[PDB]
């Protein structure tokens, strides 16, 4: 039965936990790679980040 | 050469009045206040022409 | 009509470097014709074709 599937041939437990990492690594707060910028010439009066 | 004023342009006198200090996002802008409208524009960029 | 064969006489040439924030100011702009212009590296036609 163990030759059915490699499962990778990674150990139970660390699929169990490559879960939960995989909801750690599409979470939004970690994503914090920005793509584009808008060029536009502006005065910056009361700047916020967002 | 003399640059013609464009057709939207306003004739208005230049006068101590006009220009004065004012509040404008934490800052003490040269605020300029129009003459007709009576709107304060405390960025030399915006005004009216 | 005809090309200027000599070196021309031209207008100085103020680099502005804009970035992402500045601040702007006017106090002693010149009054004769400059060129302005925005990036330093602007001798880019470099291949000459015989």
Same mark, same amino acid.
């Given at each position: ?50 | @050469? ?9 004739? /208005?006198? %230049?006068? =101590?009045?006009? @220009? ?9 802008? /040269?605020? %300029?206040? =129009? ?15 | ?50």
């Amino acid at each position: 039965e163990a030759f059915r599937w490699s499962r990778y041939f990674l150990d139970e437990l660390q699929l169990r936990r490559l879960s939960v990492g995989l909801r750690l690594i599409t979470n939004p707060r970690i994503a914090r790679r920005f793509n584009g910028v808008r060029i536009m010439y502006l005065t910056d009066d009361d700047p916020d980040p967002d | @050469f003399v640059p013609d004023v464009p057709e939207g342009y306003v004739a /208005v006198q %230049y006068a =101590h009045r006009l @220009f004065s200090s004012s509040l404008a996002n934490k800052r003490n802008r /040269v605020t %300029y206040t =129009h003459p007709p409208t009576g709107m304060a524009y405390p960025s030399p960029t915006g005004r009216p022409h | 009509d005809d090309v200027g064969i000599m070196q021309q006489k031209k207008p100085p040439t103020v680099v502005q470097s804009r970035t992402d924030v500045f601040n702007e100011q006017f106090a002693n702009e010149a009054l004769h014709p400059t060129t302005k212009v925005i990036f330093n590296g602007l001798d880019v036609n470099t291949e000459v074709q015989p």
